[PDB]
């Protein structure tokens, strides 16, 4: 395993190099919004992001060493979390707006056009505002995203101790980044705690979002791809 043989800098550059591209939406400024249309846009984007995410996870150090079965499980639990922290990250410098795509920038008012959406919009906007005041760096973001992929499903399965080992390495990397930025030890630990506590909120937003996705599936007016349905079924809501 080369994942535990990587330095902090080698960890950072690897994660940075593995970054998925910013995809565009099929958004038509001519077309008036409807519920079905806006949701259709968002579910379509998510489906396309998923393909890039799955191939991104392969390039996360340590993920390849897991069994296929364990890879499937981690991605099934964490996929909406990964999307969400990605959405929040690229929305950082657009206060009061979520940048789903470069051509798809939405405020909370447009989230109200979809019943039950607004609550999730506000939580995402608050997360994005929190990253802004912390001045979250790209190097820290990619660490947090990899932590989510490895940590979220680890309590729901010999192989775990390897996962926790990789997780410990990423923690080392975060601290290395903070010490590099001139922070004191007290500040390093405080910032580390601040960043990891965000993940609690990201889990919460995902759980809520998953429930919303389940409801969309039931009223059956918004087209959901087969992959998106399978990720949804993986959480087994009733």
């Amino acid at each position: 395993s080369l994942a535990l043989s990587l330095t902090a800098d080698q960890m950072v550059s690897a994660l940075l190099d593995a970054e998925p591209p910013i995809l565009y939406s099929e958004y038509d400024p001519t077309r008036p919004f409807s519920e079905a249309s806006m949701m259709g846009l968002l579910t379509n984007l998510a489906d396309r992001e998923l393909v890039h995410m799955i191939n991104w996870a392969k390039r996360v150090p340590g993920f390849v060493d897991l069994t296929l079965h364990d890879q499937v499980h981690l991605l099934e639990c964490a996929w909406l979390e990964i999307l969400m922290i990605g959405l929040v990250w690229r929305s950082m410098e657009h206060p009061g707006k979520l940048l789903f795509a470069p051509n798809l920038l939405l405020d909370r008012n447009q989230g109200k056009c979809v019943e039950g959406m607004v609550e999730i919009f506000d939580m995402l906007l608050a997360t994005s505002s929190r990253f802004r005041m912390m001045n979250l760096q790209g190097e820290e973001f990619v660490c947090l995203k990899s932590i989510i992929l490895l940590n979220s499903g680890v309590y729901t399965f010999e192989e775990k101790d390897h996962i926790h080992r990789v997780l410990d390495k990423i923690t080392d990397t975060l601290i290395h980044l903070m010490a590099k930025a001139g922070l004191t030890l007290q500040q390093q630990h405080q910032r580390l705690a601040q960043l990891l506590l965000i993940l609690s909120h990201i889990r919460h937003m995902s759980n809520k979002g998953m429930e919303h996705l389940y409801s969309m599936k039931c009223k059956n007016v918004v087209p959901l791809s087969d992959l998106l349905l399978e990720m949804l079924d993986a959480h087994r809501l009733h």
């Binding site: 799955i54 191939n55 996870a57 296929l68 499937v72 991605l75 992959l227 399978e230 990720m231």
Partner: peptide, 10 residues
């Protein structure tokens, strides 16, 4: 089996 399974294989 499922799609995620296949995409993780290729």
């Amino acid at each position: 089996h499922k799609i995620l399974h296949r995409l993780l294989q290729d």
